[PDB]
Amino acid sequence: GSLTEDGLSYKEKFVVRSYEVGSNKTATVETIANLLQEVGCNHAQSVGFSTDGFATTTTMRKLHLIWVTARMHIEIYKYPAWGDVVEIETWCQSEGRIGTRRDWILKDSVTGEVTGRATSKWVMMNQDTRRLQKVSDDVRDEYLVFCPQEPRLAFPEENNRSLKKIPKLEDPAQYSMIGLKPRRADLDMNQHVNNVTYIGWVLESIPQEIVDTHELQVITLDYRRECQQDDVVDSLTTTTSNDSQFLHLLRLSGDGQEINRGTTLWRKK
Amino acid sequence: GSLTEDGLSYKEKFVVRSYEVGSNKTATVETIANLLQEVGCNHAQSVGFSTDGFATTTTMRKLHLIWVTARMHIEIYKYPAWGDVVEIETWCQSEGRIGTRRDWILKDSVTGEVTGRATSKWVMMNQDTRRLQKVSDDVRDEYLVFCPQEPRLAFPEENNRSLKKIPKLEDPAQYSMIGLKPRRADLDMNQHVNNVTYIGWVLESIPQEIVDTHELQVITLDYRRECQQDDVVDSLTTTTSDSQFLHLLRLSGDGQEINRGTTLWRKK
Ligand SMILES: NNC(=O)c1ccc(O)cc1
Numbered sequence A: 001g002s003l004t005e006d007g008l009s010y011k012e013k014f015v016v017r018s019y020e021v022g023s024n025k026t027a028t029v030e031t032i033a034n035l036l037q038e039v040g041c042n043h044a045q046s047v048g049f050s051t052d053g054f055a056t057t058t059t060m061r062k063l064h065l066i067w068v069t070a071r072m073h074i075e076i077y078k079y080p081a082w083g084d085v086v087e088i089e090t091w092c093q094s095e096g097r098i099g100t101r102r103d104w105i106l107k108d109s110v111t112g113e114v115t116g117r118a119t120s121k122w123v124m125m126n127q128d129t130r131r132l133q134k135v136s137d138d139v140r141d142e143y144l145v146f147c148p149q150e151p152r153l154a155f156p157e158e159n160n161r162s163l164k165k166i167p168k169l170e171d172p173a174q175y176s177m178i179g180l181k182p183r184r185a186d187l188d189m190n191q192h193v194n195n196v197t198y199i200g201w202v203l204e205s206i207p208q209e210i211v212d213t214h215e216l217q218v219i220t221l222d223y224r225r226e227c228q229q230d231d232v233v234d235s236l237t238t239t240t241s242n243d244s245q246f247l248h249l250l251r252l253s254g255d256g257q258e259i260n261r262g263t264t265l266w267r268k269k
Numbered sequence B: 001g002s003l004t005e006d007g008l009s010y011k012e013k014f015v016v017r018s019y020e021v022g023s024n025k026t027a028t029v030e031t032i033a034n035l036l037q038e039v040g041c042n043h044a045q046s047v048g049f050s051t052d053g054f055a056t057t058t059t060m061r062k063l064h065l066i067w068v069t070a071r072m073h074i075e076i077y078k079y080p081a082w083g084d085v086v087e088i089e090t091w092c093q094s095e096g097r098i099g100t101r102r103d104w105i106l107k108d109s110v111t112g113e114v115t116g117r118a119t120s121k122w123v124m125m126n127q128d129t130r131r132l133q134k135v136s137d138d139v140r141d142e143y144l145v146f147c148p149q150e151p152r153l154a155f156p157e158e159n160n161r162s163l164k165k166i167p168k169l170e171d172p173a174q175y176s177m178i179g180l181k182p183r184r185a186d187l188d189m190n191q192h193v194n195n196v197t198y199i200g201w202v203l204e205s206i207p208q209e210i211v212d213t214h215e216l217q218v219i220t221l222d223y224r225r226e227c228q229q230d231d232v233v234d235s236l237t238t239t240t241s242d243s244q245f246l247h248l249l250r251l252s253g254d255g256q257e258i259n260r261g262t263t264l265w266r267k268k
C-alpha cells in the first residue's frame, strides 16, 4: 500500500482469499468492510498516527478522545471473485465541528473499472465517559494537513442514499434472528466488538431465499450504542418495498435497547 | 505465492492485518489457521486442481469423493505482529490407504526463523452419503506425482504430540460456553461451517483470565461430525494439569460429539 503523489489519499491492493468468499465465489460484503477498515488503518499509519489509537492526534490522546463510527454506507456494483485483485483508494475530510468523514473507491485492478464505493461518518467521544463532543479547533487544525482542501466525495449526487434518515422498525418485525452473541474472533485489538460484526448481525435476519436469488447492492448502517462482549443481540428485518428493500434493527435481547438501525437494497440476480 | 523449484511444495507471504490480531497486537490462532487453509488452496490450484473441489482429482470428481479434515495440530513459538510478514511453506504426502497429510512451516520473513508448524490428517468420504470408506489405487497414483517421495514431516520426533490419542471429557466440565451458533460469515463457499470456526468454538470455553495471562502454544483438534448451519453447539473444557486443557464440542440438544481436543498454554 502507499500514499498517492500528493499525500492526500492512500491506495492498497488485496488478493481475494478462499475463506473470504460466499456461494457465488465472490467476496462477501463483510470481507469488503474488513478491507475498507484495513486500508483506513494503513492510511492513518502512513501519515504518522500512532498504534495506541486509530487516527488519534496528539491533543486527542492528551484528552482521552477517540473517533467512533456513527454511520457506514457501502454500494457494490460487482463483488471481486476469489483470486482477483481489488484496488482500494481512501481519504479523509473534516466536516466542520460535527466530526470527520472517510471515503473509499473500489476498483478492479485489471480493468481499472469502479466496482464499489463507500463513505463513513465519525464522531469524537471521550474514551472513559463515552460522552460525544464537537471537534475543537486545535484537533481540526492537527488533521487538516492530511485532508484535501476542496471537497472530494465518493457520493457526490445532490440527494444521495448515503445521507438519508433511517426510521425505527416497529414491532412486529417480518423476520428475526434472536440470541446473537459475539465470540473472541468478533473482537478487535482493544477487546471491543469489530464494526463489521454488526453488519453480519444485521444481515442474519435476511431470509436465505433472498440471499440465494438476489445480490446485495447497498447497505446503510447507523451505530447508536455498543454491544459489549457479554451482551446478546436480536436482529429484526421488515421488507419496505426487480429490487427488494429492507428496514433493519439490532437491539439488546433483554431490555430491547437499540444498538443499530439500517437499510439494505438488493437486486434480482 | 509460488511452487518451489522442485514443484513439490508451495510458499506464500502474508502481511498480518489490523483486524486479524488480538489484544497483544499479534495474529490470533484463528488468523493463523485461515492462512494455513489459504496457502493449502493456493497450492492445490497451482498443481492443476479445479475450482469445484479442494484437491479432488479427476477420478474423485467422477465418484463424488471429497477430502475431509480428521485432525488439525498447530504449534506456535511466536505469533506474528500486526504489519509483519509471515512466510508459510506447505506440502502434501500420501499415508498409504488411510488418507493424506498436509504439513506447514511458518517463518518470520525478515529473520528466516521458524515461528510455527502445523500438520493435518485428511480422509476420503463420499460427498452424498457421508461414508468414510476410503481407497487408494487410482486416486493415490493421480496425486503421488505432486508429493515428495521420501517422507518430509513438520513433526518428525517419534511418539510426538500430533499423533497422540485424545480422551473424551467426562461431565461435569470445569468450564463451558453454551448455545454457540454459526452465522453466514462462519460458512465457506459451499455453505458448510469453516473448519477454523470449530477452533474458535473450542477456545470460547477457556476462561478470560487464562487468555489474558497465558500464550496458546499447542492445539490438537479431532473432527468427528459437522455442525450444520441450523445446529447449536456447547463448548466444554477441563484443566488436566504450563497449563493443559481437555476440550469437547457437542450438539446442545442430544449431546452428539462433533469435536474433541487438547490445548497447551505457557505463562507470558
Ligand atoms: N453480498 N452478500 C453478502 O456478503 C451477505 C453477507 C451476509 C449475509 O447474511 C447475507 C449476505
Ligand SMILES: NNC(=O)c1ccc(O)cc1
Residues within 6 Å of the ligand: A184, A185, B022, B027, B028, B029, B030, B200, B203, B204, B206, B211, B215, B216
Ligand atoms: N493465541 N490466542 C488466540 O488466538 C485465541 C483465540 C481465541 C480464543 O478464544 C482464545 C485465544
